Design a protein around this nucleic acid. Structure first.
Ligand SMILES: [K+]
Ligand SMILES: [K+]
Ligand SMILES: [K+]
Ligand SMILES: [Mg+2]
Ligand SMILES: [Mg+2]
Ligand SMILES: [Mg+2]
Ligand SMILES: [Mg+2]
Ligand SMILES: [Mg+2]
Ligand SMILES: [Mg+2]
Ligand SMILES: [Mg+2]
Ligand SMILES: [Mg+2]
Ligand SMILES: [Mg+2]
Ligand SMILES: [Mg+2]
Ligand SMILES: [Mg+2]
Ligand SMILES: [Mg+2]
Ligand SMILES: [Mg+2]
Ligand SMILES: [Mg+2]
Ligand SMILES: [Mg+2]
Ligand SMILES: [Mg+2]
Ligand SMILES: [Mg+2]
Ligand SMILES: [Mg+2]
Ligand SMILES: [Mg+2]
Ligand SMILES: [Mg+2]
Ligand SMILES: [Mg+2]
Ligand SMILES: [Mg+2]
Ligand SMILES: [Mg+2]
Ligand SMILES: [Mg+2]
Ligand SMILES: [Mg+2]
Ligand SMILES: [Mg+2]
Ligand SMILES: [Mg+2]
Ligand SMILES: [Mg+2]
Ligand SMILES: [Mg+2]
Ligand SMILES: [Mg+2]
Ligand SMILES: [Mg+2]
Ligand SMILES: [Mg+2]
Lengths: 138, 63, 98
RNA sequence: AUAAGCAGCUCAAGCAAUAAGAAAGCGAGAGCGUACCUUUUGCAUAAUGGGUCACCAAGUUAAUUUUAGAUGCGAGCGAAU
RNA sequence: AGACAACACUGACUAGGAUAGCUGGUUUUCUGCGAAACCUAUAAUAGUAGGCAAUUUAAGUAACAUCUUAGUAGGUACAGA
RNA sequence: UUAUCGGUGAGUAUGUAGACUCGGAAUGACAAAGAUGAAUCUUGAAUAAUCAGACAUAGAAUGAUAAGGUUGUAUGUCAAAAGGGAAACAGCCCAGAACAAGAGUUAAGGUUCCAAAAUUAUUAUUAAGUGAAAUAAAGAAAGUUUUUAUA
RNA sequence: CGAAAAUUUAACGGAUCUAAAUAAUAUACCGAAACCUUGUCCAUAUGUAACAUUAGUAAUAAUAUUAAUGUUAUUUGAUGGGGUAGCAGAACGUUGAGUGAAUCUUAGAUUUUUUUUUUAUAACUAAAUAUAGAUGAUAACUCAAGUGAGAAUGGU
RNA sequence: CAGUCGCGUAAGCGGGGCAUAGGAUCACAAGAUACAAAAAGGAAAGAUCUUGGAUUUUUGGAAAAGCUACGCUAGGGAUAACAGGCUAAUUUGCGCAAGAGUGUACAAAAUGAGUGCGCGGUUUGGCACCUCGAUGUCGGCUUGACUAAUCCUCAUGGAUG
């Protein structure tokens, strides 16, 4: 098994040798958790700082990305709709609605390639003088 | 106090006793009639039309 | 003297509760380390010395938890809260008879 | 004009724009806070210095001898024809 | 009468030429690291020098700190006569 | 001739201890291997400040077993360290401040009101406001409670 | 009870308390700038991508790439954060100078103010007042210092 | 390691003493060295090695008496002339406990040896946080305020004495 050590107290006023025991365990600041194998070398290391730490036997050692994921609070929100944005290194990402799911990013050297409405598109929409909504829908 | 955070702690008022009985398991709907004045949008049962289907028994009689 | 270090001679019931809980917390660290090794059939010299010459919080007398031996006191006893860093230091045994 | 504030800071009622829009400022009331510098083991100290404001007012130059970095040439370099 | 000799006399006034291990002062911001009040020498103890040693940043590390295990030096607390 | 004076021999007799230590810790010190660790170490080049420290705890010397006295040693803090607790507080108890937010989690310390949090539970004592965050002593006494004996 | 001192109750901090005292226990809660979480700033790293500048190297009549520097983002969900004496790095500002026979100015250069915004010892927006075509102001980079003052019983 | 001596059968030992208590340079002097020799040949004066004379005894190495109440300047206030602060040895400050003894008798009416446990901050001191109105640290005057360990005035217990 492993020893789960957490520095509960500080050593601001304790002798210098007590700081050398907390430096070998790896406890720099307060409430810092380290995992050390169950061995006589570490066990005698904890008998010197047993008034400042809290020891616990754990089956497996926890990684750096797993000790922090147990104090991480749930985001509490989910982005369901995003509006058009310009990403500097990728391109112009269009609008996406994750409720019906599409991050399509069009990049180019012309306005038409970007996928936006240009001046020419506004001239084609302005000349369509025949388009009319159905009478039933009007 | 010295900082705004220290002021918020000295001026703290705890929530109502009712909210502090959090369920350990599952969700529960509780009756918490507040000690306050009701607005005019809480139409009394006498002013509701017979057609309206929301005329329930007092919430006291639903527990 | 003239410099006032207002330290009472006795502890309060709140300090005693934390002194009791601090002695009982050092017992769990020695009991966790002693059982963790026994499973592996291993032992340490400092873990065996502690259990030999040091008592647990349930085996200590009230006068050994809240007092220490001071040869300069009238009854050879002194408040344990007078010891430097007494909150982060181990002190359970006093000379026999004192 | 019932009050014992190094006059700031945290909390903040209220007042304040004739008008659509727009609140800087002042602030009752609650709390926190014993100037600055020098000199000292240590200063609110009843230890030193200053009435306020503006301006003047202190590691610089020369020669010499070194080092680091950068750069020119290179067993030559620099200088000079 | 150490009295008087033109503000000054236990030796005047004026001009020229000083030092001060002593005291005071030394002016913009941000960032990194971070002491000592000990030893030795000194007509020295309010100073200074050499160490210990703070800083800068290069080359090294079987570095340094702590623990475990085995070993070693040395006679205190205690105890004893 | 003496349970008189001194001296001698015997005692596994009693005490005494800075220069008595037969016995003898812990601690600290030296070095080896392994492991862990926050580079904390060494060297090269360049180059400082400092040289009345103070208090606290332990243990001594000195004084008078006086001093916020003087002087070593061990450890820490202050010095150069703000914040919380100690009513106020350089040195004590916690904890090392890059800036905000949070009835977030805790240390020391506290929770009737000033003033954030218990007028929270259990068993006894006290009747003196004793006491409640800086123990005045020996001693006295049909104060009172408990225990051990006891009529 | 012993227990007596000179401004005033006078070392419960005070109100007060028969526990809100004392002794032996138990639990919850409060509680720091400590810790945690979510963001921010700063310092030092480690790779990658993109933007700009400068300087090279290729392509182009039918743009790609290399290196340095600046910058944002991102990977390791990187590490680190008090400070006197003292040491070190990086910047801003002031005055004068070169580029400058340059740029801009009645379509308002410049105005010791006020105001606005930007991680900000600084500049900027707007407003109000006055009226200059250069003996005016000025970016950027660079050069040199009579360059920064709440502290000398300092001096005017 | 080289040189060359002693002792010992040999191994071997010997760069004084069982260990721990005797200072340089400069100058000066005596030997060696053969380095340099201010035009040159020599020399003088220098250089290296060995050695000597030192209460160089302030022993990391000056040839060295006082006064200033007439003192000066720059400083510190390591407490120095005062007061405050800490301590309480001492006191011309007191209390309590115990009771040898005195009291014709009888401890405690009174008296109380040598002592023990204490309070207090007046005298003479100790310390030195602290530079300031002092060496008789104090007197008189004016004007107080407070304390109670009481000289007077008021109430009262004990006193074969
Ligand atoms: K200057
Ligand atoms: K004269
Ligand atoms: K640091
Ligand atoms: Mg520190
Ligand atoms: Mg005092
Ligand atoms: Mg009023
Ligand atoms: Mg001083
Ligand atoms: Mg004053
Ligand atoms: Mg002053
Ligand atoms: Mg003045
Ligand atoms: Mg100037
Ligand atoms: Mg030190
Ligand atoms: Mg000096
Ligand atoms: Mg022995
Ligand atoms: Mg002292
Ligand atoms: Mg200092
Ligand atoms: Mg502090
Ligand atoms: Mg309190
Ligand atoms: Mg809460
Ligand atoms: Mg409350
Ligand atoms: Mg009381
Ligand atoms: Mg009181
Ligand atoms: Mg922090
Ligand atoms: Mg920090
Ligand atoms: Mg810093
Ligand atoms: Mg203007
Ligand atoms: Mg001035
Ligand atoms: Mg010749
Ligand atoms: Mg000649
Ligand atoms: Mg000498
Ligand atoms: Mg010597
Ligand atoms: Mg002093
Ligand atoms: Mg008689
Ligand atoms: Mg009387
Ligand atoms: Mg009578």
């Amino acid at each position: 098994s492993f020893f789960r050590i957490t520095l509960h107290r500080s050593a601001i006023g304790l002798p210098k040798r007590t700081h050398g025991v907390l430096a070998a365990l790896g406890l720099r600041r307060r409430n810092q958790t380290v995992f050390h194998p169950v061995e006589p070398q570490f066990a005698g290391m904890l008998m010197k700082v047993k008034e400042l730490v809290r020891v616990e036997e754990v089956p497996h050692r926890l990684t750096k990305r797993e000790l922090k994921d147990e104090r991480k609070p749930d985001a509490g929100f989910v982005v369901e709709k995003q509006v058009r944005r310009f990403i500097p290194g990728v391109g112009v990402q269009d609008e996406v609605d994750f409720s019906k799911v599409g991050a399509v990013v069009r990049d180019g050297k012309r306005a038409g390639d970007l996928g936006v409405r240009t001046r020419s598109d506004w001239e084609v929409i302005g000349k369509m003088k025949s388009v009319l909504p159905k009478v039933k829908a009007l | 106090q010295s900082t705004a955070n220290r002021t918020k702690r000295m001026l703290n008022i705890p929530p109502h006793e009712s909210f502090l009985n959090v369920p350990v398991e599952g969700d529960r709907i509780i009756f918490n009639p507040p000690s306050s004045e009701a607005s005019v949008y809480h139409t009394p049962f006498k002013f509701l039309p017979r057609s309206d289907p929301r005329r329930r028994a007092n919430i006291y009689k639903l527990f | 003297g003239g410099l006032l270090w207002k330290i009472p001679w006795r502890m309060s019931k709140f300090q005693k509760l934390r002194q009791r809980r601090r002695l009982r917390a050092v017992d769990n660290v020695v009991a966790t380390i002693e059982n963790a090794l026994a499973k592996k059939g291993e032992t340490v010299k400092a873990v065996e010395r502690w259990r030999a010459e040091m008592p647990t919080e349930a085996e200590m007398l009230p006068k050994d938890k809240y007092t220490i031996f001071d040869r300069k006191e009238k009854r050879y006893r002194k408040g344990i809260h007078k010891l430097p860093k007494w909150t982060r230091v181990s002190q359970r045994v006093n000379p026999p008879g004192y």
